[PDB]
Design an enzyme around this catalytic site. Structure first.
Site, PDB file in Angstrom:
ATOM      1  N   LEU A 104     -31.884  16.328  21.952  1.00  0.00           N
ATOM      2  CA  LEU A 104     -33.157  16.627  21.283  1.00  0.00           C
ATOM      3  C   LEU A 104     -34.080  17.491  22.156  1.00  0.00           C
ATOM      4  O   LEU A 104     -34.512  18.558  21.725  1.00  0.00           O
ATOM      5  CB  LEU A 104     -33.900  15.358  20.866  1.00  0.00           C
ATOM      6  CG  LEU A 104     -33.254  14.385  19.892  1.00  0.00           C
ATOM      7  CD1 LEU A 104     -34.097  13.111  19.869  1.00  0.00           C
ATOM      8  CD2 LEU A 104     -33.067  14.990  18.503  1.00  0.00           C
ATOM      9  N   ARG A 145     -35.631  18.108  26.660  1.00  0.00           N
ATOM     10  CA  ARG A 145     -35.694  17.778  28.094  1.00  0.00           C
ATOM     11  C   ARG A 145     -37.163  17.705  28.509  1.00  0.00           C
ATOM     12  O   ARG A 145     -37.877  18.705  28.486  1.00  0.00           O
ATOM     13  CB  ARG A 145     -34.938  18.807  28.947  1.00  0.00           C
ATOM     14  N   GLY A 146     -37.617  16.504  28.849  1.00  0.00           N
ATOM     15  CA  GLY A 146     -39.002  16.282  29.252  1.00  0.00           C
ATOM     16  C   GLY A 146     -39.097  15.960  30.727  1.00  0.00           C
ATOM     17  O   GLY A 146     -38.075  15.758  31.392  1.00  0.00           O
ATOM     18  N   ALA A 147     -40.324  15.910  31.238  1.00  0.00           N
ATOM     19  CA  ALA A 147     -40.558  15.619  32.651  1.00  0.00           C
ATOM     20  C   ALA A 147     -39.681  14.461  33.153  1.00  0.00           C
ATOM     21  O   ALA A 147     -38.898  14.634  34.089  1.00  0.00           O
ATOM     22  CB  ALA A 147     -42.039  15.347  32.904  1.00  0.00           C
ATOM     23  N   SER A 148     -39.781  13.307  32.490  1.00  0.00           N
ATOM     24  CA  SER A 148     -39.050  12.091  32.887  1.00  0.00           C
ATOM     25  C   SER A 148     -37.543  12.033  32.569  1.00  0.00           C
ATOM     26  O   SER A 148     -36.853  11.106  33.017  1.00  0.00           O
ATOM     27  CB  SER A 148     -39.776  10.832  32.379  1.00  0.00           C
ATOM     28  OG  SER A 148     -40.150  10.969  31.022  1.00  0.00           O
ATOM     29  N   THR A 182     -33.913  13.681  29.883  1.00  0.00           N
ATOM     30  CA  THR A 182     -33.355  14.225  28.650  1.00  0.00           C
ATOM     31  C   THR A 182     -33.429  13.143  27.558  1.00  0.00           C
ATOM     32  O   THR A 182     -33.123  11.974  27.827  1.00  0.00           O
ATOM     33  CB  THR A 182     -31.883  14.622  28.858  1.00  0.00           C
ATOM     34  OG1 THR A 182     -31.770  15.421  30.037  1.00  0.00           O
ATOM     35  CG2 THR A 182     -31.344  15.404  27.674  1.00  0.00           C
ATOM     36  N   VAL A 183     -33.850  13.528  26.348  1.00  0.00           N
ATOM     37  CA  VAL A 183     -33.926  12.603  25.216  1.00  0.00           C
ATOM     38  C   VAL A 183     -32.887  13.008  24.173  1.00  0.00           C
ATOM     39  O   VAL A 183     -32.762  14.194  23.826  1.00  0.00           O
ATOM     40  CB  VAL A 183     -35.348  12.529  24.595  1.00  0.00           C
ATOM     41  CG1 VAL A 183     -35.351  11.633  23.370  1.00  0.00           C
ATOM     42  CG2 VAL A 183     -36.360  11.997  25.600  1.00  0.00           C
ATOM     43  N   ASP A 195     -51.793   9.855  30.761  1.00  0.00           N
ATOM     44  CA  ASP A 195     -51.178  11.126  30.374  1.00  0.00           C
ATOM     45  C   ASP A 195     -51.073  11.210  28.847  1.00  0.00           C
ATOM     46  O   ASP A 195     -50.090  11.701  28.288  1.00  0.00           O
ATOM     47  CB  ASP A 195     -49.836  11.369  31.085  1.00  0.00           C
ATOM     48  CG  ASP A 195     -49.347  12.803  30.937  1.00  0.00           C
ATOM     49  OD1 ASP A 195     -50.185  13.723  30.867  1.00  0.00           O
ATOM     50  OD2 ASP A 195     -48.118  13.018  30.884  1.00  0.00           O
TER      51      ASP A 195
END
Ligand SMILES: CC(C)(C)S(=O)(=O)c1ccc2nccc(Nc3[nH]nc4ccc(F)cc34)c2c1
Ligand SMILES: CC(C)(C)S(=O)(=O)c1ccc2nccc(Nc3[nH]nc4ccc(F)cc34)c2c1
Lengths: 277, 281
Positions: B21, B23-26, B28-29, B135
């Site tokens: 879906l 790739r975020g800071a924390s 991969t989703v 955040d």
């Protein structure tokens, strides 16, 4: 290795406590939490052992957290008051939806199927816990409906005998009880009739059932225009079979329902719901 | 004293149809389906190990109606990840800014969303000890099948700065314990929700924004961005302005915002919410 504690709610934080109903496990009232600013539901019955039950129910709801299980918000445990707090279900129970026909003249098929799918998802979740948790009291009265008519199951793992399998009369270890109840519920959902409507005594039902008789399946009870009629009839008939061994697991049940649910566009569910308002 | 629920451990091989879906800071989703439970799920994956574990623990402890529900954790030699319910309707960000895909977003829906973000954050603040987001942005306000709010990524390349209060620009023990950070973000979100416009749209230099913001400047509260026809305009503009006040002590608590929002919500008939969703499909 990750634990989470169930919040303790001070009785003074619950405002507008209004009576909803009373039943075998206690009285249910609607309220609002003064701090969180949401509507809630409160369940209250105190004997030396009557306490261990209320606490066991709350522990069960807390461990069985899932999308189709009534979400528990916290335990109200003080020397004064003892109660369980959960989200408030604004749409009542499946029983009301099926049988209040003046209030609900039309309950479109897509919504009926979604409800049947979710009840199965919820029960399937319970059975897959370690250790397996069995409902054993599944009925239309404890299948609740949220703000968008999604299912939340309550009162599991702890009245009416139409949902009880024959072998359960004359057992507590049986994993084929829930599916039996589910077959009856399915029949009830698709027909909007009361199971064994012509019976004037619970004992007459229990008698018929022990002899292999079941809610009537014919064109009057289940019209020929019901979508996927044949498949649902098979599911019902195998679910309430006299022989527990011939009853399907919820896995099998879900695998049969999945292709049925795919035939419905997501917007038909929303339209079915708005029709009810 | 209390009752304890253990978070289920989910074997990785129990996840089928795993699709990428974002790739975020924390991490991969991905979306997937659980082979035994028969539901869709979202999966977040990358010793940077106890960071995943902490996010899981936080999601598990902050369980509530407007918080992203966690279903279990994947903890194996090969794979580490968190499993949650799948949000079919993305983030608030995509709702506000994909104007082609979403020509209209009816006011009652906008107000329910604002009311729900507030109930969510408020709930975090009321835990013991209080849990702070720090955040809060439109990218992590997630929307479920019927557009109800679930907030993710609280208590944990860099992202956007527009939701950050000036005092936090140079962090310390003072600002990392500030209980007036979230309300500032909420105020900006409130403005972005009511207008469907990027805050500081004119300025395309993120650093310039930080200066303007330090000097007192906020997003343009004029007629052009916030039309007169906006339901309860006066009351909302008042809510925003006090939320993003240059001074932290002049900012209201969430409980305070809720009490004002309650009457506003009651003015919309239930039916309108359902009408708003059908229009979005
Ligand atoms: C059933 C009805 C529609 C006739 S009702 O009006 O009584 C009603 C309405 C709404 C509800 N909303 C939530 C939970 C309800 N009941 C509960 N079942 N199991 C519970 C365990 C703990 C708990 F706190 C509440 C519990 C509700 C009951
Ligand atoms: C953001 C987007 C809309 C661009 S997406 O397509 O990436 C998307 C879609 C759907 C989702 N559904 C659920 C949860 C999502 N993300 C998460 N935030 N925090 C998480 C922590 C654990 C976890 F397992 C998932 C988490 C989703 C993300």
């Amino acid at each position: 290795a990750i634990c989470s504690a169930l919040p303790t709610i001070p009785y003074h934080k619950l405002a507008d406590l209004r009576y909803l109903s009373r039943g075998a496990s206690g009285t249910v009232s609607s309220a609002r939490h003064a701090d969180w600013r949401v509507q809630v539901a409160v369940k209250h019955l105190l004997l030396d052992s009557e306490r261990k039950d209320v606490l066991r129910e709350a522990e069960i709801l807390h461990k069985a957290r899932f999308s189709y299980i009534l979400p528990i918000l916290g335990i109200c445990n003080e020397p004064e008051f003892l109660g369980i707090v959960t989200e408030y279900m604004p749409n009542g129970s499946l029983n009301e939806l099926l049988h209040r026909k003046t209030e609900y003249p039309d309950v479109a098929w897509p919504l009926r199927f979604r409800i049947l799918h979710e009840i199965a998802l919820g029960v399937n979740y319970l059975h897959n816990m370690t250790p397996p948790l069995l409902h054993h009291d599944l009925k239309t009265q404890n299948i609740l409906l949220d703000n968008e008519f999604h299912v939340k199951i309550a009162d599991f793992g702890l009245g009416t005998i139409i949902y009880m399998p024959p072998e359960n009369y004359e057992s507590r270890a049986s994993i084929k009880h829930d599916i039996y109840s589910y077959a009856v519920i399915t029949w009830e959902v698709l027909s909007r009739k009361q199971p064994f409507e012509d019976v004037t005594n619970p004992l007459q039902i229990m008698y018929s059932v022990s002899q292999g008789h079941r809610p009537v399946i014919n064109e009057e009870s289940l019209p020929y225009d019901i979508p996927h009629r044949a498949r649902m009839i098979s599911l019902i008939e195998s679910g309430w079979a006299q022989n527990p061994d011939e009853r399907p697991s919820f896995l099998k049940c879900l695998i049969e329902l999945e292709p049925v649910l795919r035939t419905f566009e997501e917007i038909t569910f929303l339209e079915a719901v708005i029709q009810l308002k």
